[PDB]
Amino acid sequence: MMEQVCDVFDIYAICACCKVESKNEGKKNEVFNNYTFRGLGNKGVLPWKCNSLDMKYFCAVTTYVNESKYEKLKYKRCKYLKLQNVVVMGRTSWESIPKKFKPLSNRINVILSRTLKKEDFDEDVYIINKVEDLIVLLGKLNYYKCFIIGGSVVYQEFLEKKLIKKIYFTRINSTYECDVFFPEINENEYQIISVSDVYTSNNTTLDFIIYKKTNNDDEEEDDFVYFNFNKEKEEKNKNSIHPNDFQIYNSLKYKYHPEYQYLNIIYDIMMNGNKQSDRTGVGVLSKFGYIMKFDLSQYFPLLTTKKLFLRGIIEELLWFIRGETNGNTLLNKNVRIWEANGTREFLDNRKLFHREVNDLGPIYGFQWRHFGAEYTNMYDNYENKGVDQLKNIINLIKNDPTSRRILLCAWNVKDLDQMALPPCHILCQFYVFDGKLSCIMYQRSCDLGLGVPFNIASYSIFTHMIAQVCNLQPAQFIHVLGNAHVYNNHIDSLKIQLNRIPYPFPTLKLNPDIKNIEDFTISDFTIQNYVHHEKISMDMAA
Amino acid sequence: MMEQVCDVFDIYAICACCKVESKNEGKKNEVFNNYTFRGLGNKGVLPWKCNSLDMKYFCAVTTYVNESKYEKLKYKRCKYLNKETKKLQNVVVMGRTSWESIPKKFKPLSNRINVILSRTLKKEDFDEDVYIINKVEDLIVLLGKLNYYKCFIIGGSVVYQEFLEKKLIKKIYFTRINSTYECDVFFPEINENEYQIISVSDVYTSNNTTLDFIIYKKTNNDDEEEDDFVYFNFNKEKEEKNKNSIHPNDFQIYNSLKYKYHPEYQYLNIIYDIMMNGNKQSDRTGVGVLSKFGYIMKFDLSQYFPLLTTKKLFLRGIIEELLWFIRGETNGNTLLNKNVRIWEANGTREFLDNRKLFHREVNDLGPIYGFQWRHFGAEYTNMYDNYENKGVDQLKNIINLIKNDPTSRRILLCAWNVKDLDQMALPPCHILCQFYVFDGKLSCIMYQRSCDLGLGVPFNIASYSIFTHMIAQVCNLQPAQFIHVLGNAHVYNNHIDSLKIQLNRIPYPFPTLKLNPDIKNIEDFTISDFTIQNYVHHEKISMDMAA
Ligand SMILES: NC(=O)C1=CN([C@@H]2O[C@H](COP(=O)(O)OP(=O)(O)OC[C@H]3O[C@@H](n4cnc5c(N)ncnc54)[C@H](OP(=O)(O)O)[C@@H]3O)[C@@H](O)[C@H]2O)C=CC1
Ligand SMILES: NC(=O)C1=CN([C@@H]2O[C@H](COP(=O)(O)OP(=O)(O)OC[C@H]3O[C@@H](n4cnc5c(N)ncnc54)[C@H](OP(=O)(O)O)[C@@H]3O)[C@@H](O)[C@H]2O)C=CC1
Ligand SMILES: CC1(C)N=C(N)N=C(N)N1c1ccc(Cl)cc1
Ligand SMILES: CC1(C)N=C(N)N=C(N)N1c1ccc(Cl)cc1
């Protein structure tokens, strides 16, 4: 006994909005939200011109029909009063459509206009006079679903009339000039229930999310239940971790966005992690073994559910490449990532009494460029001492790309004790095929709340660097987690974070001129179109 | 289209079978097939007496009902009889002896309609709420009168015999108890032409025996969010780059399966993934391989020893190798004198010279595994030198951390000594091991840089599973998960036909591994301290059909 039209006639909306350039601030924005993506059109045309991928989506969604499911619909459409779908649109829009493709192939075409006269058009192409008019027309017709493909004005009113069931919203992650925008969706009316994978098309990233109106053969089916007869009736920390804490996170239907690979792990550890001791005093929840994969050819996996800064980690990466072990080099650039591990107190607890403060010992950088060399102090000359692994893996990539020995290992067993701290990131393995570079990095200890996000970005950038100086395109960054833990003092922050819906990922642009791994400088890196949620202090006590 | 009794009334059979105590005439090498599992009962009772997990499964299957589907089922059955316009239960049918084998406190089976076949007894002879029938046909008449979800034939042999004989069974829920017991009753030999295995469950351990659940099938002769799934998969290319070299009909059995939950499928699926999507690359002297990058397999060592069953595997070799590793040895002669040739090819004059190790004695493998495990950092001289207290004894170290600082996130064993690589006859394929300890249980992750799925991987999995057991035992812990990480995973083309065959074999429940409980030091193990039990396996497959 549903008294709602949009729900009976299956009236959906579908669009694609890009970011709009604020004459006040410019491209680099200070705050974001769903209303960030609102650019609809410009000069009677699309802000971008052609988005080969979004186009394929538009078509696929509006031309898709499931005939074996139709009767159920008609049964109720007639009760309330070659199958195809219905595509409503405003005059202006219908006009911006190129002749050869108009009217839309395999669609029901209906133009909501008051100047257009039935005659001018053929029986096929319909023409309505107003909102209410449509509804009736849908009665005297046979269709699967009805899609409002624009324009702005049509969207605007239809949202007021509350005649929209769902909104297929495409987020174009780039800025363009616009003159017409999509209505600010009221989060009390419509809410995101699905977010797709992230892609790159026409030199820009984009994704697809779904807005849903807030309501406020068989033999093998039982065999599935049988095989589950021994499944857990409950979760370890299910109690300690409440449910109304993740209603949004758990309200989503399809979470294909890559960021969920990180978020889902957070969830698993909060719901099933093992409670353990920790020298730091506080406790943690830990699990053993996880995998995340990012397609660097489609996006740069910099988290968006919170804010992340990259200057620090890029400088750290350049510091590694130079083979330095001098913490002062980072402190003088205000990169305090290693400061705690280079203090008098920290070095002494490691029993390195004869080590100068900030002399981190034979860590990463030294192992990458001098594995095997005898470590004296951070100021010594190590030219041509030890094994230059970095150089070697680059030559392997260039001259023997099919090798299965392209590894960069920082876990020098003989030098662990001499290190301020043993490496968390154990090694890197590279793989090359059809001019593409993928990288696997094994991490023995992973702090999901604070370190992992930076760890992801760090190696993604590194894969980009190695690829460029080898004339390859980055492909996959595979992150293998050993001990994965969440600090108890981060649980509250992570709960907030798991309920934030990801924005399409940004992209990484490297100065194309740099051709040798050793020539990169801080200015040679640029993160573009990074749309993100607000900063979150994992440690809320400060 | 006519209707078939078994389908209209949904008549299923559920059983449990073990391995019989049949004679072996002294032939160590026993042959295996499904008929291997056929022990129903003995002396009026179960061959094994009791098995919690299987019984829990039996109760789960025979009492589960989905009242939603009945509406549809009432339609069918009614339309079949030509008739058409309170808690739904299943029907269990059983023979006289089966009924008498049930313990009084469990009679009649709870939440189920109990039907008993008999001639020597009538309703007057029963106190319980049950139905008696003196002939099969009566069951059909009765089913037509009752309101039930599904009908299950739960034995005994005589009963299974007639129901399969009369072609009344739609599917068979078969439990394979992987152990041997004295028996005097057997389940009928299932005809491969009538029934085909369509699902294989995960493997488990219960009452000192592993077991799995398989389903045989009778062979021939919010809904809107569903549309959204279609949309999001709009960018899918329904193509596979190697389907042309690997035809569909070559994986009939493999693809026919519905549920592939047996742990062995983690291996098989990777193989299948590489054959259908691998990358074509070169090798040593034009040899071809298909490869992918980055895989992961997980094995619950508390429930089974993951020794592949779709082909025969011997472990004497990889065990000796492991003890050789633990002893820190680099002398290939030691293995050869035990008729273990795993390292033979890598220690020849020709091989060593090709590696530029001109001054290395034949079979002196150099600073490999063993050495790095007990002396990482020490200068390698020759396989006969004494390296006592030289280099870092990683093995000893990781054992102390597991014992005294179990929460440490530094318990790693690494054989990839960047400085010694060139001095090694061959660089290590198994780069490292990380251990994890929680609640008295030990888990292990092993990263392998290069993986030969056809030959190597099967042995690699067994090697590290055994090592996890050994380490867990000398540390007073219980083995848990062996997690295998694959970097460069490849399949040699010379192996494709052999693997296509293997992919079409159904896995048997895994065996178990037994270690002499007295060995408490990682260094005190000997070949006679390792025992594999109940290894049911397919025929050995020679990967290379050109030898
Ligand atoms: N990214 C996206 O998803 C979309 C982008 N666009 C872009 O935006 C631009 C067009 O949008 P827009 O300016 O809003 O124009 P519209 O396409 O929405 O058409 C508006 C016109 O349609 C008729 N109309 C609308 N509502 C009613 C009503 N209630 N009753 C009677 N007639 C009505 C009237 O035409 P009249 O009375 O004169 O006959 C009106 O002037 C183009 O540049 C196009 O490329 C358009 C749709 C979607
Ligand atoms: N592992 C497993 O899954 C199972 C094991 N078992 C075991 O097997 C043994 C019992 O099997 P089994 O010896 O074959 O005995 P059954 O359970 O099959 O019972 C056979 C008897 O039931 C009656 N019966 C069977 N068919 C008919 C028919 N068509 N018409 C009339 N009466 C019929 C007759 O008894 P009557 O003399 O009264 O006329 C007959 O002698 C026990 O050891 C038990 O523990 C049993 C079921 C399953
Ligand atoms: C192709 C495009 C931009 N993309 C989406 N996701 N939704 C629409 N309604 N579109 C659209 C189609 C036709 C016209 Cl005239 C205007 C916009
Ligand atoms: C418990 C057991 C062995 N287990 C399974 N999977 N199938 C049966 N039919 N069983 C069974 C049920 C009732 C009786 Cl009387 C005998 C055996």
* DSSP assignment of A359-427: B--S-HHHHHHHBTPPP--TTS--TT-SB-HHHHHHHHHHH-TT-S--EEE---GGGTTTSSS--SEEE
Q: Distance between CA A328 and CA A455 in Å, rounded?
A: 22
- State the nearest Cα–Cα gap between A22 and chain B, in angstroms: 32
**Nearest CB partner across the interface for B377, out of A60, A274, A414:** A414
What is the distance of C-alpha B191 from the center of its chain? 24
From CA B318, how far away is CA B337, in angstroms rounded? 14
C-alpha to C-alpha distance for A172 and A113, rounded to whole angstroms: 28
Q: With CA atoms as reference, report the closest residue to B16 among B207, B232, B145, B165.
A: B207
Note the resolution in Å, 1 decimal: 2.6
CA atoms within 13 A on the CB side of B146: 24
Q: Which helix (H) or strand (E) holds A153?
A: helix A152-160
DSSP-derived pairing of the beta strands B210-218 and B204-205? antiparallel
Ligand 1 atom nearest residue A130's Cα: 30
Long-range contacts of A456-459 (CB under 8 A, 24+ apart): A456/A262, A456/A292, A456/A294, A456/A301, A456/A302, A456/A303, A457/A300, A457/A301, A457/A302, A457/A303, A457/A308, A457/A310, A457/A313, A458/A313, A458/A316, A458/A317, A459/A425, A459/A428
Query: Residues 6 or more apart from B58 whose CB is under 8 A from it?
Result: B14, B16, B154, B175
Kindly provide the residue ranges of all beta strands, DSSP E only, lying in A91-189, ordered along the sequence.
Answer: 108-112, 126-128, 143-148, 166-176, 180-181
Q: Which residues of A are known to be catalytic?
A: 424
- Find the A51 Cα to ligand 1 centroid distance in Å: 20
* Alpha carbon distance B117, A129 (integer Å): 75
Whether B487 has its CB under 8 Å from any CB of chain A: the answer is yes
For residues A430 and A440, give the distance between their C-alpha atoms in angstroms, rounded to a whole number.
7
Q: How far is A58 from chain B (nearest CA, A)?
A: 10
Token pair 């999001």 in the structure block, residue: B232
B15, B18, B14: which is closest to B508 by C-alpha? Answer: B18
Bind-site residues of A for NADP(+): 16, 40, 44-45, 91-93, 113-115, 152-155, 157
Interface of A with B in 178-237 (CB under 8 A): 193-194, 196-197, 199, 208, 210, 218-220, 222-227, 229-230
Which residue matches tokens 């699902």?
B199
Cα–Cα distance between B262 and A78 in angstroms, integer?
50
Ligand nearest to the CA of A161: 1
Direct distance between the N- and C-terminal alpha carbons of chain B, in angstroms, rounded to an integer: 53
- The DSSP call for residue B179 is E
Q: Which residue has the tokens 């133009």?
A: A111
Token code pair at residue A473:
């395109």
Q: How many CB atoms lie within 10 A of CB B320?
A: 18
Q: How far is the CA of B297 from the centre of ligand 4 (A)?
A: 33
DSSP assignment, residue A95?
H
* Cα R_g (chain B), whole angstroms: 28
3-class secondary-structure state, position A145: strand
- Distance (angstroms) between ligand 2 centre and the Cα of B160 equals 8
Residue of A15, A20, A57, A92 to test ligand 1 pocket, by largest number of atoms within 8 Å of CB: A92
The DSSP line for B73-92 is HHHHHHHHHT------EEEE
Residue A55 CB less than 6 A away from ligand 3: yes
Residues in chain A after which the chain is broken, C→N over 2.5 Å: 81, 216
Helix (H) or strand (E) holding B216: strand B210-218
Calpha distance B275→B262 (Å, rounded): 20
- The reply to whether B126 touches chain A by the CB within 8 Å rule is no
* Structure-block tokens of residue B70: 């009945």
Q: At what angle do helices A52-63 and B225-232 cross, to 10 degrees?
A: 150
**Interior angle at CA A8, CA A7 and CA A13, nearest 5:** 50
- List the end-to-end C-alpha distance of chain A, in Å, as a whole number: 53
Whether residue A230 and residue B419 make contact (CB cut-off 8 A), yes or no, is no
Ligand with the closest atom to the CA of A114 = 1
Cβ distance A185 to A159 under 8 Å?
A: yes
Residue nearest to atom 10 of ligand 3 (CA): A15
Q: Which residues of B does the annotation mark as catalytic?
A: 429
A478 to chain B, minimum CA–CA distance in Å? 7
Q: How far apart are CA B161 and CA A429, in angstroms?
A: 58
Query: Which burial class, exposed, middle or buried, applies to A492 when counting CB atoms under 10 A from its CB (0-12, 13-18, 19+)?
Result: middle
Mind listing the domains of chain A with CATH numbers? 1-214 (3.40.430.10), 217-257 (6.10.250.2210), 258-542 (3.30.572.10)
Got the DSSP string for A186-228?
-TTTEEEEEE---EE-SSSEEEEEEEEE-----HHHHHHHHTT
Amino acid, single-letter form, for residue A149: I
Neighboring chain A residues of B171 at a CB cutoff of 8 Å: 219
Task: Point out the ligand nearest to the CA of residue B112.
Answer: 4
- DSSP conformation letters of A5-26: HHHHTTEEEEEEEEEE-BTTTB
Q: How far apart are CA A527 and CA A300, in angstroms?
A: 8
**3 state DSSP class of A274:** strand
Q: Tell me how many degrees the CA angle B64-B65-B70 measures, rounded to the nearest 5.
A: 160
Q: State how far residue A252 is from chain B, nearest Cα, in angstroms.
A: 11
Of A208, A414, A480, the CB nearest to B232: A208
Task: Give the distance from CA B192 to its chain's centroid.
Answer: 22
Say which experimental method was used.
X-ray
For residue A88, how many C-alpha atoms fall within 13 Å in the half-sphere facing its CB?
29
State the amino acid at position A57 in one-letter form. Y
Q: How many CA atoms lie within 13 A of A200 on its CB side?
A: 15
CA nearest to A292, candidates A264, A254, A250, A253: A264
CB B434 within 8 A of CB B464: no
Which letter does DSSP use for residue A131 in this model? H
Show the beta-strand stretches assigned E in A26-125: 37-41, 84-90, 108-112
Ligand 1, residues at Cβ distance < 6 Å = A 15-17, 40-41, 44-46, 90-93, 96, 112-116, 130-131, 150-154, 157, 180
The rounded Å distance from CA A91 to ligand 1 centre is 6
Which residue does chain B place closest to A421, by CA atoms? Answer: B410
The helix (H) or strand (E) run that includes residue A261 is helix A260-272
DSSP collapsed to 3 states, B465-504: HHHHHHHHHHCCCEEEEEEEEEEEEEEEHHHHHHHHHHCC
Q: What angle do CA B13, B16, B22 make, to 5 degrees?
A: 125
The answer to whether residue A312 neighbours chain B at the CB level (below 8 Å) is no
CB nearest B232 (choices: A196, A218, A230): A196
Beta bridge partners of residue A210, listed in sequence order? A168, A194
Q: What are phi and psi of B79, to 5 degrees?
A: -60, -30
CA-based nearest residue in chain A for residue B483: A289
* Centre of ligand 1 from the C-alpha of residue A41, in Å: 10
Token pair recorded at residue B162: 């007639």
Task: Output b/e per residue, A94-118; b: 16+ Cβ within 10 A.
Answer: beeeeeeeebbeebbbbbbbeebee
